[PDB]
Amino acid sequence: RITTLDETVGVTMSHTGMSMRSDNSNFLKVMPKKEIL
């Protein structure tokens, strides 16, 4: 069955939106004229 996360919610909800934590995973990161003559 589906497992229910029992934590204090605020941790998971902090990991949802902006959490001041970016990156941490690499994915889709992607003259003389005479001589010249």
């Binding site: 996360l5 919610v9 995973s25 690499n26």
Partner: protein, 41 residues
Amino acid sequence: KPMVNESDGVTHALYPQEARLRNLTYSSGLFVDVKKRTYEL
């Protein structure tokens, strides 16, 4: 479990009584284990 995220940003447990009094929606959050891979083929 059912929860409510307010306007200031605090998220706490929800009860049906307070859900009816505050005109909220008795719902629960849903998460998914999202796995990503990169092939190079």
